[PDB]
Design an enzyme around this catalytic site. Structure first.
Site, PDB file in Angstrom:
ATOM      1  N   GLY A  81       2.113  34.050   7.550  1.00  0.00           N
ATOM      2  CA  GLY A  81       2.214  34.205   9.000  1.00  0.00           C
ATOM      3  C   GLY A  81       3.638  33.923   9.435  1.00  0.00           C
ATOM      4  CE  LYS A  82       6.527  38.874  10.341  1.00  0.00           C
ATOM      5  NZ  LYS A  82       5.155  39.283   9.918  1.00  0.00           N
TER       6      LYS A  82
ATOM      7  CG  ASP B 285       1.584  29.228  24.710  1.00  0.00           C
ATOM      8  OD1 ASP B 285       1.123  30.067  25.530  1.00  0.00           O
ATOM      9  OD2 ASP B 285       2.474  29.504  23.873  1.00  0.00           O
TER      10      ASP B 285
ATOM     11  CG  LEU C  86      -6.188  26.245   9.597  1.00  0.00           C
ATOM     12  CD1 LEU C  86      -5.658  26.095  11.023  1.00  0.00           C
ATOM     13  CD2 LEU C  86      -7.540  25.598   9.484  1.00  0.00           C
TER      14      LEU C  86
ATOM     15  CB  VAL D  96       2.952  29.712   8.207  1.00  0.00           C
ATOM     16  CG1 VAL D  96       1.964  28.812   7.492  1.00  0.00           C
ATOM     17  CG2 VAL D  96       3.198  29.229   9.643  1.00  0.00           C
TER      18      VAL D  96
ATOM     19  CG  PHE E 209      -0.081  22.351   9.386  1.00  0.00           C
ATOM     20  CD1 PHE E 209      -0.534  21.513  10.434  1.00  0.00           C
ATOM     21  CD2 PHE E 209       1.196  22.910   9.499  1.00  0.00           C
ATOM     22  CE1 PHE E 209       0.227  21.325  11.546  1.00  0.00           C
ATOM     23  CE2 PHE E 209       1.954  22.711  10.577  1.00  0.00           C
ATOM     24  CZ  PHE E 209       1.481  21.908  11.639  1.00  0.00           C
TER      25      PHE E 209
ATOM     26  N   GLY F  47       9.676  30.272  13.337  1.00  0.00           N
ATOM     27  CA  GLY F  47       9.928  30.339  11.898  1.00  0.00           C
ATOM     28  C   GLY F  47       8.828  31.065  11.130  1.00  0.00           C
TER      29      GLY F  47
ATOM     30  CE  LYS G 144       5.050  25.848  13.703  1.00  0.00           C
ATOM     31  NZ  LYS G 144       4.354  25.287  14.883  1.00  0.00           N
TER      32      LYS G 144
HETATM   33  C1  LIG Z   1      -3.067  30.438   8.210  1.00  0.00           C
HETATM   34  N1  LIG Z   1      -2.084  29.926   9.157  1.00  0.00           N
HETATM   35  C2  LIG Z   1      -1.961  28.589   9.378  1.00  0.00           C
HETATM   36  N2  LIG Z   1      -2.679  27.763   8.570  1.00  0.00           N
HETATM   37  C3  LIG Z   1      -2.522  26.452   8.803  1.00  0.00           C
HETATM   38  C4  LIG Z   1      -1.735  25.946   9.820  1.00  0.00           C
HETATM   39  C5  LIG Z   1      -1.070  26.873  10.614  1.00  0.00           C
HETATM   40  C6  LIG Z   1      -0.267  26.443  11.765  1.00  0.00           C
HETATM   41  C7  LIG Z   1       0.027  25.123  12.149  1.00  0.00           C
HETATM   42  N3  LIG Z   1       0.794  25.056  13.229  1.00  0.00           N
HETATM   43  N4  LIG Z   1       0.991  26.343  13.550  1.00  0.00           N
HETATM   44  N5  LIG Z   1       1.744  26.677  14.637  1.00  0.00           N
HETATM   45  C8  LIG Z   1       1.896  27.992  14.855  1.00  0.00           C
HETATM   46  C9  LIG Z   1       1.307  29.002  14.080  1.00  0.00           C
HETATM   47  C10 LIG Z   1       0.520  28.632  13.011  1.00  0.00           C
HETATM   48  C11 LIG Z   1       0.381  27.246  12.726  1.00  0.00           C
HETATM   49  N6  LIG Z   1      -1.154  28.193  10.389  1.00  0.00           N
HETATM   50  C12 LIG Z   1      -1.410  30.876  10.086  1.00  0.00           C
HETATM   51  C13 LIG Z   1      -0.816  32.126   9.535  1.00  0.00           C
HETATM   52  C14 LIG Z   1       0.070  31.062  10.102  1.00  0.00           C
END
Ligand SMILES: CN(c1nccc(-c2cnn3ncccc23)n1)C1CC1
EC number: 2.7.11.23
Length: 340
Positions: free
Chosen positions: A32-33, A153, A107, A39, A104, A37, A54
């Site tokens: 993800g992005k 947000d 997810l 992830v 983290f 920044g 992240k």
């Molecule tokens: C699977 N992913 C994930 N998994 C665990 C934590 C986070 C996360 C924690 N803080 N943030 N803030 C902004 C955007 C995402 C996240 N994202 C998401 C694709 C990025």
């Protein structure tokens, strides 16, 4: 050359598949992005588990936003060691090659991704109810006095599934958050989800997040944003189509009332030169008596008139113009929309 060859021209770390960090993490792939920044999925060799890292941009404004986020996450996670209140778990953080990195739990898909996967036709009322119950429980936790956190947000993209086959969620992204009585921001919330008190330049509190939640829940079931304004004037006009002119006692105290409204001789307020105020009924957006959104829920179980009337009632309480009487998390959880 940026950061000795480690960065691109956007302040981001250039991901390398299979790279080892700190005798601990093996970077797998980008997952993800966003503005902050990137992830990455990484294997934590010490704890023997996959994690999401992240990687904040190497630029002071982005670094300092993330330092605020770290402090709030540490405070929230300390008061939910059993992870029962639906906030993402920050395991640890570190500085690496001039980037702040937040580790983290991993997810799955976000709720906007889920809407795309429905072809923008919406998830069922039953799945909407499951997401609503978890979100109200999270808002109850944020309102505990040692926290008093305003997310600021909320939107579908900031709510993530824990696992692709299940309905459990976590809330992410506290970069723009604040605490009651340590509030600093005049300009906040993404436009479609922005509360009337913020649009009007008035004082605000945790009730702004309940407004955003009501907007989110309608969109989860219809597939489309409730109030899709192109600018602040269009946003307020779209809110008025559904909910009418805001109360006079509010507009009489609003610094930005005259951006949108004009006061008549008799003391009442009207719009400045859309469907007439209040005539775009939520009753018809939801399809209460006509088979749900687009009529597509006609003939399906789990979508009765009585069910829809309870959903409508709860949403209209979340969309109260007055932040003092708007429904609060404790009472939202007791509402008959939710099951025993
Ligand atoms: C699977 N992913 C994930 N998994 C665990 C934590 C986070 C996360 C924690 N803080 N943030 N803030 C902004 C955007 C995402 C996240 N994202 C998401 C694709 C990025």
């Amino acid at each position: 050359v940026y950061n000795d060859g480690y960065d691109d021209d956007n302040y981001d770390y250039i991901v390398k598949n299979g790279e080892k960090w700190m005798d601990r993490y093996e970077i797998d792939s980008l997952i993800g992005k966003g503005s902050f920044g990137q992830v990455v999925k990484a294997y934590d060799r010490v704890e023997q588990e996959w994690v999401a890292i992240k990687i904040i941009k190497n630029k002071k404004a982005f670094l300092n936003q993330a330092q605020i986020e770290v402090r709030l996450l540490e405070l929230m996670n300390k008061h939910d060691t059993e992870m029962k209140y639906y906030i993402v778990h920050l395991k640890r953080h570190f500085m690496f090659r001039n980037h702040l990195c937040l580790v983290f739990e991993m997810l799955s898909y976000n709720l906007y991704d889920l809407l795309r996967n429905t072809n923008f036709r919406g998830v069922s009322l039953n799945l909407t109810r499951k997401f609503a119950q978890q979100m109200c429980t999270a808002l109850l936790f944020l309102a505990t006095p040692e926290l008093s956190i305003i997310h600021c947000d909320l939107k579908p993209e900031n709510i993530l599934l824990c696992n692709p086959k299940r309905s459990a969620i976590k809330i992410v992204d506290f970069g723009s958050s604040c605490q009651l009585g340590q509030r600093i921001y005049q300009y906040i919330q993404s436009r479609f989800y922005r509360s009337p008190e913020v649009l009007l330049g008035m004082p605000y509190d945790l009730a702004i997040d309940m407004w955003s939640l009501g907007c989110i829940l309608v969109e989860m079931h219809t597939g489309e944003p409730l109030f899709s304004g192109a600018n602040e004037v269009d946003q307020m006009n779209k809110i008025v189509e559904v909910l009418g002119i805001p109360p006079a006692h509010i507009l009489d105290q609003a610094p930005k009332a005259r951006k949108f409204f004009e006061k008549l001789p008799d003391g009442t307020w009207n719009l400045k030169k859309y469907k007439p105020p209040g005539t775009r009924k939520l009753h018809n957006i939801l399809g209460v008596e006509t088979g749900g959104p687009g009529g597509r829920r006609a003939g399906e179980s789990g979508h009765t008139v009585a069910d829809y009337l309870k959903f409508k009632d709860l949403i209209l309480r979340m969309l109260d113009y007055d932040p003092k009487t708007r429904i609060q998390p404790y009472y939202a959880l007791q509402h008959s929309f939710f099951k025993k």
